[PDB]
């Protein structure tokens, strides 16, 4: 059960960092999208 | 350790569902940006 715990914490933390990386990209691309759409 | 595994596993599935949905939204917005840029 300790072996399952470390796998669960690492999978959760890796997912959280990837989700934050995508969220910053979405904010960047949607800002470009509305400017490009206006032009 | 068992209560830590339940909490760690719960935030892993919660993060994974948000991250997968966000990745599909990124792909959708990038495809829409590519189409609008071509126009």
SS (H, E, C) chain A: CHHHHHHHHHHHHHHHHHHHHHHHHHHHHHHHHHHHHHC
Whole-angstrom distance, CA of residue A5 vs CA of residue B2: 8
The answer to whether the Cβ–Cβ distance between B32 and A32 falls below 8 Å is: no
Q: Determination technique for this PDB entry? A: cryo-EM
Whole-angstrom distance, CA of residue B3 vs CA of residue A2: 11
Q: Is B21 on the interface with A (CB under 8 A)?
A: no
- For A11, name the nearest residue in chain B, comparing CA atoms only: B12
The answer to whether the Cβ–Cβ distance between A26 and B23 falls below 8 Å is: no
Residues A7-39: b if buried by 16+ CB within 10 A, e if exposed: ebbebbeebbebbeebeeebeeeeeebeeeeee
Number of residues in chain A: 39
The structure was resolved to a resolution in Å of 4.2
Assigned token pair, A32: 């470009």
By C-alpha distance, which of B34, B35, B9 is closest to A11?
B9
Whole-angstrom distance, CA of residue B11 vs CA of residue A25: 22
Q: How many A×B Cβ pairs under 8 Å?
A: 55
Give CA torsion, residues B28, B31, B32, B33, to 10 deg.
Answer: 120
Whole-angstrom distance, CA of residue A17 vs CA of residue A32: 23
């Amino acid at each position: 059960i300790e072996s399952d715990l470390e796998r669960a914490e690492e999978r959760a933390e890796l997912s959280e960092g990837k989700c934050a990386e995508l969220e910053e990209e979405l904010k960047t691309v949607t800002n470009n999208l509305k400017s490009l759409e206006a032009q």
